[PDB]
Amino acid sequence: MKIIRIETSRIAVPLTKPFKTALRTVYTAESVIVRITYDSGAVGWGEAPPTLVITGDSMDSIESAIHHVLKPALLGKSLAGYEAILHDIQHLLTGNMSAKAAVEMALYDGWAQMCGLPLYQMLGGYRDTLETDYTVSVNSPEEMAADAENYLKQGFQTLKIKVGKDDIATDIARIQEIRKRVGSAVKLRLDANQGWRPKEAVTAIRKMEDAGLGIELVEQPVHKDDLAGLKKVTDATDTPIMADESVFTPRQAFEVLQTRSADLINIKLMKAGGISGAEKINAMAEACGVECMVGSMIETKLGITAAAHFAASKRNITRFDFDAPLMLKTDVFNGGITYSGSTISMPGKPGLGIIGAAL
Amino acid sequence: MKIIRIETSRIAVPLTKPFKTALRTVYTAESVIVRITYDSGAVGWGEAPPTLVITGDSMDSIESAIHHVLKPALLGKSLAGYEAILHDIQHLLTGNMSAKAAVEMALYDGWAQMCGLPLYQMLGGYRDTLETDYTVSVNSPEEMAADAENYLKQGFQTLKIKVGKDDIATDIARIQEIRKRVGSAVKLRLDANQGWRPKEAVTAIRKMEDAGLGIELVEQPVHKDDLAGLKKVTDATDTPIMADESVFTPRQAFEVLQTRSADLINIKLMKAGGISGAEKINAMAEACGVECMVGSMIETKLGITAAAHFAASKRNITRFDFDAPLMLKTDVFNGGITYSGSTISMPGKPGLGIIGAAL
Amino acid sequence: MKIIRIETSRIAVPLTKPFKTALRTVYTAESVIVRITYDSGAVGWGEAPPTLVITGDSMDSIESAIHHVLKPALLGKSLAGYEAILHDIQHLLTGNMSAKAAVEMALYDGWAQMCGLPLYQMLGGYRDTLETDYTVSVNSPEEMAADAENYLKQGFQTLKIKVGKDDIATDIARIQEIRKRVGSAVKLRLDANQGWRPKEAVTAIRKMEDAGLGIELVEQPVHKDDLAGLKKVTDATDTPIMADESVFTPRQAFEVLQTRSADLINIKLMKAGGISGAEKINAMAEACGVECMVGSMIETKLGITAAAHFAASKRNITRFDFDAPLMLKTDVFNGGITYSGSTISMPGKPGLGIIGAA
Amino acid sequence: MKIIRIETSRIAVPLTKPFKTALRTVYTAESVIVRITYDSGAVGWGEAPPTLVITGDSMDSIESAIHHVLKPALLGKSLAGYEAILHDIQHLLTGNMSAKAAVEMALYDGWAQMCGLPLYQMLGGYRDTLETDYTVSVNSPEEMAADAENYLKQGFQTLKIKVGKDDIATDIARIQEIRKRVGSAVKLRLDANQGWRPKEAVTAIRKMEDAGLGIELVEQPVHKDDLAGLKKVTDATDTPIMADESVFTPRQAFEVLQTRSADLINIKLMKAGGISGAEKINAMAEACGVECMVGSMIETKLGITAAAHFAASKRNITRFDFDAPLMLKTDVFNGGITYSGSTISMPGKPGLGIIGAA
Ligand SMILES: [Mg+2]
Ligand SMILES: [Mg+2]
Ligand SMILES: [Mg+2]
Ligand SMILES: [Mg+2]
């Protein structure tokens, strides 16, 4: 199994719900698609979207990194020496985690195909189905509660709500209105996206507790670099605190675990620069009795399939956040995982199970 | 591929150098051999010797654990669901690490055969040859200097010396004599086997470097559960200090790395309960910039072959202590690794490469 | 036991003495190496070199056939029903005999491993050693005779000489110089590689008879499709005539045997699409009292090892042409058969005995 | 895997329905049972009944051949060298095909046990179940018709009928009455046992077509040595003609196939001297597009088990005639194949699968 060709292409898939950034309004989901062709004729697939605010990677930086650094280093190499290939991918350049992840996806796809197994089975095969949460778009508490009940009826028992942008009072009113229409029938996951200061986070999370909102967990309440602050929120509340942006790499996972700064860890391939890193983070957490969740960036079903195969393979990964593909007006890929309500099913073919560009 | 049969047997290979325990004189190397048969026709092999003083495992405890707990839980299981199998092996019972290790060997043997690759390649395939050290048996400094010369003439440039039993003056005199024969033509690794107190170890190690003995590293100078003491020795000497008995599991590795109590870690399958735990230890160590060594207990080529496959696959594993097989009068196994002087070569067929009993 | 992976790799081994074709100059011997891995831990090996002039297969056609046709039909299958697998391999596509043969090699290798026996014993194990001939490169009669004597001293009592390209007189001059030089006991095998017309062949073969050259046999004197002509040469000379290119498959073997168009049959795995067909050809011949020889195309020790295992197993196979690996500057495979002069020895490990790359 | 002991014993199983020969009344099915013991402890089984009219072999000729010729030649031989052993069995003495067959059964039984696989899988494993026809005894048209209907209700959709003994009008009247009872619910195989002259057979078969009897096939219509005659019948009828007594060995199979004298070939281990020859006949036939059937002589489940294993293993063997065991009042063997209506199923243990006496 030798790598003989590496190609990249760009895609732009219209969003069902456009959103605005500080500089513009996004109507499409862009990402770099990677195709690694092996001497066996097999094709490994990878995906990497830009996340200027989270990783700092852009379409241009991702493609350049793949064409100027990773590609010339991977050509001709064989998957028999995987340890060395992964080390080169992670160390030939600093950062550019997204570019590295896209390449790792295609490599693990090739690796699983080589062994004749679905990627998730190659990584441990713990489960073949998993439940994904669904995001309730921010809006008036009344509108969110409406969407929430309808998502509940569609089979989603876990909903995700972004908080930490508006007033704490606004966040709380929204969640209250939501429970008013669904009760405990659904679990509520919040992501503050580093929007609060430590003391401000403790206050808001306790308020929700006093209001008996029963929050399942709160992701990254404080600034990613503020570990001591993240730990303050963890030790001052009864609601589990999940580290997201604070943990990209296994070394950062080790720091968070060592200081006991969080109850849980949210893993994403883009942040870890791929599966190898993601695996190390989860294994590390597991040994410390800390469960993990696997999420993603705005990605098509390709990136979500790689993410899902990794998540499905580990016992210690007990939560999943893979609704990005459901936010696209179209599915441009043939194969991969399949959705039935909130239930994601793993494919049976070797590798990722991605056949090619849909039609 | 499903497990359909699990058998065990005992072997006794006469040692080339019998030694004495507190209760008797040992002439043979005893071990429990495990054979797992898969519905594909594949056979997985594993080994586990008793280590009453190191692990507390005996031939009977090992065999009983395999037949009454591990076996009934593994028969009928599919390797496509490895994660669940590993979890059961490690958690169905406490301790019994050697029994868990023996079963893990045969399990990974089959897993590699199911994916059709030499085990070390399945785990990363970083190198296909490695250099093992050789043990200079304790005796008068004169005889030790002689043996060291012969071993060196045989291709062994790295010698392991057991210290910490007699008084420091005696250890230094032994090491001095050896240097007086081979000079700086060899590297010297010491293993104090918890024989010193922290303050005492610091003094002994400093006296060695003040005598220009040039010790490569010192393994476990203090008691295994005296982490603070191990750390003291680590921060007081310029000689690298390697944790051995202080680290059995990945959780203990985490604690040692977290407190920076040692410069290196010596991994052994019997202590880690197999390869899955050994991988975790190495991965945590690597994330912390700590390299590892892989050693073993008194085992035949089978056990060593399993450990060598794990050791050869990882970049972070840079030292190897696999001379056990060279201490037996007869090699009872066919296949596995091969020795050319101090150079160990990895077999190429799928799995461990062990074909069965010697023909 | 299930097939979990089928892979191919290209190799190019520099020849000790290159040759020219109609389009270029060949400096290396290329081949497609096939590896079939089973979940039992066994790994089967196979080799298929290109032969654009003989079979029509190229490196690309061979590789494509295995990747797009044979591979998808075998992945996931088990060797419980060999009859069905072999049948499917031979009928999934027409021609592409080289691709089919390399896969059959790896399948038989795996099958013998499962049974725990060297492939040659699983097939019959008639002999443990066999004598291979050696080819005397075409040159001046003076130079060929020198090489011949040299091979004779090294232990080769049977030599093969290619004829039918140059003048008949030139062939005779070169052969007569050799026969007189090495002695009449030695056996000289000729391969006319379809270079003569029937009457032209009878004349030449008769001229060597009159010169008392003692030719052991003449391989395929006429065009492979000219069975009537091949038969004419067979019935007009005293020298035995061996069918080669005229016989690829057992059906063709049946045709040659029923018409008695040849005295012997040369079997090659590449031509028969593997060991199953080769085995049927030999069985047919034996039943007709016709002995066979096993040869090969330009292949490394892998392809030769498979050929030798098949050849060594049958009593009716009495001649061997396996010097191809000796024409390579280096041996790239570890294991397989071993050479000791002209003597080839079968290995003792299960299957083909191929360990891997050198 | 070495042969260390070879023993023989005689058995006599009472027939459910005795028959008369040109000299006496037969009430029991007799055969010689061969037991080959190997150094591993494994035991190989073989069987051979006398067929004074078909092969010429008798109980005494068989036992003597085994003890005085085959036994001293096989004692101490290893199955790793199967080819040599098979060559010895087939060539140490001429004829004596039944004795050769019995020994081969016990050898293939051990060979397969050595490889740890059911014999049928070791030979190709094409199918693991097969449909056997059933014999309708010759009697009045009305009685045969009653039997046909009966066997049908038991699951036997394919019936075999012996013809060519009586007048042509009688055979037809019998078959007509059978068609009247079951109609097209069954296939009818006829065996003329060399009872007609070529012209007479052509006439008889065309009359059966005209009568819309729908005959599946006719075995050996003419004398076994009359190949030209056999071919005439083949070419003058639309009904497929099967060679039986005309083909014992692979060489005779070659002659029949070469001349296109028959549409099909019936194989029996006793005629071919075992499985090696049977395998050659079938491979030969398959190459010519000629399908085969496998039947037997009057044998117990042991002999039929060996034949069934061979029949089940090949793709080209598409018809089966194994009702012999069903004609005995007792089954003296434990193991081997098992019946369920007309369906025969292959056992799962290594070799033939018979444990011993019942
Ligand atoms: Mg988040
Ligand atoms: Mg130690
Ligand atoms: Mg030729
Ligand atoms: Mg008949």
mmCIF file of all heavy atoms in Angstrom, chain C residues 54 160 190-194 219-220 242-245 266 268 271 293 296-297 321, ligand 3:
data_model
loop_
_atom_site.group_PDB
_atom_site.id
_atom_site.type_symbol
_atom_site.label_atom_id
_atom_site.label_comp_id
_atom_site.label_asym_id
_atom_site.label_seq_id
_atom_site.Cartn_x
_atom_site.Cartn_y
_atom_site.Cartn_z
ATOM 1 N N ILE C 54 4.106 -13.428 -26.726
ATOM 2 C CA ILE C 54 3.556 -14.758 -26.481
ATOM 3 C C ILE C 54 2.083 -14.786 -26.054
ATOM 4 O O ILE C 54 1.253 -15.367 -26.751
ATOM 5 C CB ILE C 54 4.396 -15.513 -25.428
ATOM 6 C CG1 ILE C 54 5.853 -15.596 -25.896
ATOM 7 C CG2 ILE C 54 3.847 -16.915 -25.225
ATOM 8 C CD1 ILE C 54 6.778 -16.312 -24.928
ATOM 9 N N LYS C 160 20.008 -25.648 -23.464
ATOM 10 C CA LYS C 160 18.973 -25.244 -24.404
ATOM 11 C C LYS C 160 19.517 -24.194 -25.353
ATOM 12 O O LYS C 160 20.179 -23.243 -24.932
ATOM 13 C CB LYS C 160 17.758 -24.679 -23.666
ATOM 14 C CG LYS C 160 16.612 -24.278 -24.596
ATOM 15 C CD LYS C 160 15.369 -23.819 -23.827
ATOM 16 C CE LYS C 160 15.639 -22.559 -23.016
ATOM 17 N NZ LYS C 160 14.391 -21.990 -22.421
ATOM 18 N N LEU C 190 16.463 -27.829 -28.309
ATOM 19 C CA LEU C 190 16.328 -26.680 -29.191
ATOM 20 C C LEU C 190 14.917 -26.102 -29.105
ATOM 21 O O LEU C 190 13.939 -26.834 -28.929
ATOM 22 C CB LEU C 190 16.622 -27.084 -30.641
ATOM 23 C CG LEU C 190 17.951 -27.813 -30.911
ATOM 24 C CD1 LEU C 190 18.043 -28.161 -32.385
ATOM 25 C CD2 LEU C 190 19.130 -26.952 -30.487
ATOM 26 N N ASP C 191 14.827 -24.779 -29.206
ATOM 27 C CA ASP C 191 13.537 -24.105 -29.212
ATOM 28 C C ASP C 191 13.535 -23.218 -30.450
ATOM 29 O O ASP C 191 14.232 -22.198 -30.492
ATOM 30 C CB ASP C 191 13.327 -23.234 -27.973
ATOM 31 C CG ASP C 191 11.874 -22.794 -27.818
ATOM 32 O OD1 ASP C 191 11.179 -22.642 -28.853
ATOM 33 O OD2 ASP C 191 11.424 -22.596 -26.671
ATOM 34 N N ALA C 192 12.756 -23.616 -31.452
ATOM 35 C CA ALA C 192 12.670 -22.885 -32.707
ATOM 36 C C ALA C 192 11.727 -21.687 -32.631
ATOM 37 O O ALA C 192 11.588 -20.938 -33.597
ATOM 38 C CB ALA C 192 12.234 -23.829 -33.819
ATOM 39 N N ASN C 193 11.090 -21.505 -31.480
ATOM 40 C CA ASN C 193 10.158 -20.393 -31.273
ATOM 41 C C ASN C 193 9.344 -19.989 -32.511
ATOM 42 O O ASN C 193 9.322 -18.820 -32.900
ATOM 43 C CB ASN C 193 10.909 -19.170 -30.724
ATOM 44 C CG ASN C 193 11.284 -19.327 -29.256
ATOM 45 O OD1 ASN C 193 10.410 -19.396 -28.385
ATOM 46 N ND2 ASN C 193 12.582 -19.389 -28.976
ATOM 47 N N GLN C 194 8.685 -20.972 -33.121
ATOM 48 C CA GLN C 194 7.831 -20.754 -34.293
ATOM 49 C C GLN C 194 8.527 -20.145 -35.510
ATOM 50 O O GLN C 194 7.859 -19.622 -36.400
ATOM 51 C CB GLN C 194 6.647 -19.853 -33.905
ATOM 52 C CG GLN C 194 5.884 -20.302 -32.671
ATOM 53 C CD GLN C 194 4.791 -19.317 -32.266
ATOM 54 O OE1 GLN C 194 3.777 -19.176 -32.953
ATOM 55 N NE2 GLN C 194 4.995 -18.633 -31.147
ATOM 56 N N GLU C 219 11.575 -27.810 -29.780
ATOM 57 C CA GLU C 219 10.382 -27.146 -29.295
ATOM 58 C C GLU C 219 9.723 -26.270 -30.365
ATOM 59 O O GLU C 219 10.395 -25.500 -31.051
ATOM 60 C CB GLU C 219 10.770 -26.284 -28.090
ATOM 61 C CG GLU C 219 9.754 -26.225 -26.985
ATOM 62 C CD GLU C 219 10.215 -25.358 -25.824
ATOM 63 O OE1 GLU C 219 11.299 -25.619 -25.265
ATOM 64 O OE2 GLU C 219 9.483 -24.415 -25.472
ATOM 65 N N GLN C 220 8.407 -26.416 -30.505
ATOM 66 C CA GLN C 220 7.590 -25.604 -31.415
ATOM 67 C C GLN C 220 8.295 -25.117 -32.688
ATOM 68 O O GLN C 220 8.562 -23.927 -32.837
ATOM 69 C CB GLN C 220 7.074 -24.390 -30.629
ATOM 70 C CG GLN C 220 5.849 -23.693 -31.206
ATOM 71 C CD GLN C 220 4.616 -24.572 -31.190
ATOM 72 O OE1 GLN C 220 4.276 -25.164 -30.160
ATOM 73 N NE2 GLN C 220 3.928 -24.659 -32.333
ATOM 74 N N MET C 242 8.327 -31.040 -29.507
ATOM 75 C CA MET C 242 7.596 -30.552 -28.342
ATOM 76 C C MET C 242 6.723 -29.340 -28.598
ATOM 77 O O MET C 242 7.192 -28.312 -29.073
ATOM 78 C CB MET C 242 8.564 -30.218 -27.207
ATOM 79 C CG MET C 242 7.856 -29.783 -25.926
ATOM 80 S SD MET C 242 9.019 -29.435 -24.607
ATOM 81 C CE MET C 242 9.349 -31.094 -24.010
ATOM 82 N N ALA C 243 5.443 -29.469 -28.270
ATOM 83 C CA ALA C 243 4.503 -28.369 -28.441
ATOM 84 C C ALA C 243 4.662 -27.398 -27.275
ATOM 85 O O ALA C 243 4.757 -27.813 -26.113
ATOM 86 C CB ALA C 243 3.079 -28.903 -28.473
ATOM 87 N N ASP C 244 4.734 -26.109 -27.586
ATOM 88 C CA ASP C 244 4.832 -25.094 -26.546
ATOM 89 C C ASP C 244 3.694 -24.114 -26.771
ATOM 90 O O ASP C 244 2.596 -24.314 -26.265
ATOM 91 C CB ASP C 244 6.165 -24.338 -26.592
ATOM 92 C CG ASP C 244 6.271 -23.276 -25.488
ATOM 93 O OD1 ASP C 244 5.276 -23.048 -24.762
ATOM 94 O OD2 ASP C 244 7.341 -22.658 -25.347
ATOM 95 N N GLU C 245 3.950 -23.071 -27.549
ATOM 96 C CA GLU C 245 2.929 -22.069 -27.815
ATOM 97 C C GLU C 245 1.631 -22.646 -28.399
ATOM 98 O O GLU C 245 0.571 -22.016 -28.295
ATOM 99 C CB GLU C 245 3.492 -20.969 -28.717
ATOM 100 C CG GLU C 245 4.488 -20.021 -28.019
ATOM 101 C CD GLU C 245 5.900 -20.602 -27.859
ATOM 102 O OE1 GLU C 245 6.213 -21.622 -28.504
ATOM 103 O OE2 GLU C 245 6.701 -20.021 -27.099
ATOM 104 N N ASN C 266 5.199 -28.750 -23.595
ATOM 105 C CA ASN C 266 5.867 -27.894 -22.630
ATOM 106 C C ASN C 266 4.764 -27.108 -21.919
ATOM 107 O O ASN C 266 3.967 -26.434 -22.566
ATOM 108 C CB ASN C 266 6.816 -26.931 -23.339
ATOM 109 C CG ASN C 266 7.653 -26.113 -22.368
ATOM 110 O OD1 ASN C 266 8.334 -25.164 -22.765
ATOM 111 N ND2 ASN C 266 7.614 -26.481 -21.095
ATOM 112 N N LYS C 268 3.530 -24.213 -19.068
ATOM 113 C CA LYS C 268 3.949 -22.988 -18.399
ATOM 114 C C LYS C 268 2.725 -22.425 -17.685
ATOM 115 O O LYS C 268 1.644 -22.328 -18.280
ATOM 116 C CB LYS C 268 4.491 -21.970 -19.407
ATOM 117 C CG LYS C 268 5.876 -22.316 -19.975
ATOM 118 C CD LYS C 268 6.334 -21.276 -21.005
ATOM 119 C CE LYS C 268 7.630 -21.690 -21.704
ATOM 120 N NZ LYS C 268 8.071 -20.675 -22.712
ATOM 121 N N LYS C 271 0.806 -19.534 -19.327
ATOM 122 C CA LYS C 271 -0.033 -19.942 -20.448
ATOM 123 C C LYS C 271 -1.323 -20.617 -20.008
ATOM 124 O O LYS C 271 -2.382 -20.380 -20.586
ATOM 125 C CB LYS C 271 0.709 -20.913 -21.370
ATOM 126 C CG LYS C 271 1.868 -20.343 -22.165
ATOM 127 C CD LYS C 271 2.402 -21.401 -23.139
ATOM 128 C CE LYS C 271 2.829 -22.676 -22.413
ATOM 129 N NZ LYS C 271 3.182 -23.789 -23.349
ATOM 130 N N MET C 293 7.096 -31.257 -20.034
ATOM 131 C CA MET C 293 8.194 -30.476 -19.493
ATOM 132 C C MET C 293 7.538 -29.214 -18.938
ATOM 133 O O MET C 293 6.491 -28.796 -19.422
ATOM 134 C CB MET C 293 9.187 -30.089 -20.603
ATOM 135 C CG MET C 293 10.252 -29.081 -20.170
ATOM 136 S SD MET C 293 11.650 -28.903 -21.345
ATOM 137 C CE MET C 293 11.209 -27.366 -22.237
ATOM 138 N N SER C 296 8.915 -21.676 -18.212
ATOM 139 C CA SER C 296 8.434 -20.431 -17.644
ATOM 140 C C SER C 296 8.746 -19.311 -18.606
ATOM 141 O O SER C 296 9.286 -19.531 -19.694
ATOM 142 C CB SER C 296 9.136 -20.134 -16.316
ATOM 143 O OG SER C 296 10.393 -19.503 -16.540
ATOM 144 N N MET C 297 8.389 -18.103 -18.198
ATOM 145 C CA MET C 297 8.679 -16.919 -18.985
ATOM 146 C C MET C 297 9.844 -16.310 -18.209
ATOM 147 O O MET C 297 10.385 -16.958 -17.303
ATOM 148 C CB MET C 297 7.464 -15.984 -18.999
ATOM 149 C CG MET C 297 6.200 -16.648 -19.557
ATOM 150 S SD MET C 297 6.450 -17.310 -21.241
ATOM 151 C CE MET C 297 4.768 -17.895 -21.631
ATOM 152 N N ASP C 321 12.836 -26.659 -17.324
ATOM 153 C CA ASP C 321 13.511 -25.516 -17.925
ATOM 154 C C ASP C 321 13.297 -24.329 -16.988
ATOM 155 O O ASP C 321 12.385 -23.514 -17.184
ATOM 156 C CB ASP C 321 12.901 -25.246 -19.302
ATOM 157 C CG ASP C 321 13.548 -24.079 -20.013
ATOM 158 O OD1 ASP C 321 14.627 -23.624 -19.579
ATOM 159 O OD2 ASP C 321 12.970 -23.619 -21.013
HETATM 160 MG MG MG E 3 9.299 -22.504 -25.966
#
